[PDB]
Amino acid sequence: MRRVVITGLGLVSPLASGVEETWKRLLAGESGARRVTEFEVDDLACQIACRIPVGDGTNGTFNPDLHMDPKEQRKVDPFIVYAVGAADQALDDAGWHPENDEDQVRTGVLIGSGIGGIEGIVEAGYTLRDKGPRRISPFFIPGRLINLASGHVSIKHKLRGPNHSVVTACATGTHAIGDAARLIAFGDADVMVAGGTESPVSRISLAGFAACKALSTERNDDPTAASRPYDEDRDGFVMGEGAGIVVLEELEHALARGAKIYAEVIGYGMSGDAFHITAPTESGEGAQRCMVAALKRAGIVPDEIDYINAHGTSTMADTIELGAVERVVGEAAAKISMSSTKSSIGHLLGAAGAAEAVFSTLAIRDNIAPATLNLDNPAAQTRIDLVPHKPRERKIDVALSNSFGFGGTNASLVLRRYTA
């Protein structure tokens, strides 16, 4: 089994396009939450979302034209464009652009999404009913398939290794990264472009998530205060959009070319709640077993954990997760920092785990735990440092990142500073 390190980062987020710019804004306490203006929301229970700032590419804005010609953008749903953007950044960061046969066939891609092209499916549904089948675009199917994010990235960068994709709701980005690391550890690839992408800010998606009572509805006129993980007055998640990507690389491969190393992927755990289609198990036992499995894989004990990037969606379940984490870490609780960056950028669904893996990696690099914004009145008493309001500078060598999705699908990743 080979060791796997992170050698590139990419991020298209509700704060910025770009890793350093998102991170700077995150740490400064900026929020991506705002009123949705791009489509009708006056009749929706939830009128807010965390949206990518679109522009010419300067000042941290996202210019999709820098990654895909506008004619090509019109053929796909936004989740594909976000993945290409973040993948471009990550490969640039890694200094990895496979040109010879060996480098191409040993580099793959594994990018997941939770819901994929729901928006474009609804639009094509209208074309079908209104205008008829001969008006359906030849690009309808490929531009809406979840695995075509991997597809577009592979084609653009000549990545001929394993081409794969996962779909596990809120856990997607975390499974994608764990699975890509295993592909490298087991010898199927030497480099993987891995992560998650989502474009869930659409009328049908906001309506659908409101219907199952998942979304914040009481702060439509104060959107930056809406996402408030662990707070007494939390009322549901705030949807976000974008993509997180990491370049993963076998350790010897990285050292032999002198690639800068951000951190090492050392653990990965998975479990199932087997409880309910949308509700978390009341006891948190599934989350607990997931974390335990990841730590066992990593060969570490709770005394070695510094930072936890929570699932922490700003729902009633935040406290169940907190309870499960407390049981896992025991007496180490008082020296661990745990925060939810969903307080800042909302819930990116299938991309959440990938964005949060990037943030967990930067927390190690910079020895700083991101804040939980809006934590005015914690719902529970805990010894864990929930990093309320402002980031905390502290030693961080080991980060744990949790994702617990619809259907009872749980995944955790353990990252550690690379020393030797």
Which residues 196-225 are close enough to bind a copy of itself by CB under 8 A?
A: 203-204, 207-214
Q: Which is nearer to a copy of itself, 35 or 213 (CB)?
A: 213
Q: Which of residues 283-302 bind a copy of itself (CB under 8 A)?
A: 286, 289, 293
How far apart are the C-alpha atoms of 33 and 346, rounded to whole Å?
7
- Pick 122 or 316: Cβ nearer a copy of itself: 122
| Using rule CB under 8 A, residue 70 touches a copy of itself | no
Residues 316-375 that bind a copy of itself (CB under 8 A): none
Q: Which is nearer to a copy of itself, 112 or 391 (CB)?
A: 112
130-169 binders of a copy of itself (CB under 8 A): 132-134, 136-142, 144-148, 150-152, 154-155, 157-169
Minimum gap (Å) between residue 182 Cβ and a copy of itself:
7
| CA 304 – CA 403 distance, rounded (Å) | 20
**Pair of tokens at residue 69:** 């010609």
The one-letter code for the residue type at 64 is P
Query: Tokens 């001929």 correspond to what residue?
Result: 160
Q: Angle at Cα 201 formed by Cα 199 and Cα 203, nearest 5°?
A: 130
Q: How far is the CB of 367 from a copy of itself (least distance, A)?
A: 32
Query: Quick check: 179 binds a copy of itself (CB under 8 A)?
Result: yes
Q: How far is the CB of 278 from a copy of itself (least distance, A)?
A: 5
User: 190: how many CB neighbours lie within 10 A of its CB?
Assistant: 22
Q: What is the DSSP string of 47-94?
A: -EEE---BSSSSTT-B-GGGTS-HHHHTTS-HHHHHHHHHHHHHHHHH
Candidate residues 58, 258, 274, 420; the one interacting with a copy of itself per rule CB under 8 A: 274
Sort residue 394 into left (φ over 0), alpha (ψ -120 to 50) or beta: beta
Q: Does 270 bind a copy of itself (CB under 8 A)?
A: yes
Between the CA of residue 142 and those of 65, 148, 212, what are the distances in Å? 20, 7, 29
Q: How far is residue 82's CA from residue 168's CA, in Å, rounded to a whole number?
A: 19
Residue 379 in contact with a copy of itself, rule: CB under 8 A: no
Least distance from C-beta 385 to a copy of itself, angstroms?
30
Shortest Å distance, C-beta 259 to a copy of itself: 22
Q: Which residues contact 292 (CB under 8 A, 6 or more apart)?
A: 269, 328
Residue ranges in 180-199 that form contacts with a copy of itself under rule CB under 8 A: 182-183, 186, 188
Residues 82-121 that bind a copy of itself (CB under 8 A): 104-105, 108-109, 112, 114-116, 118, 121
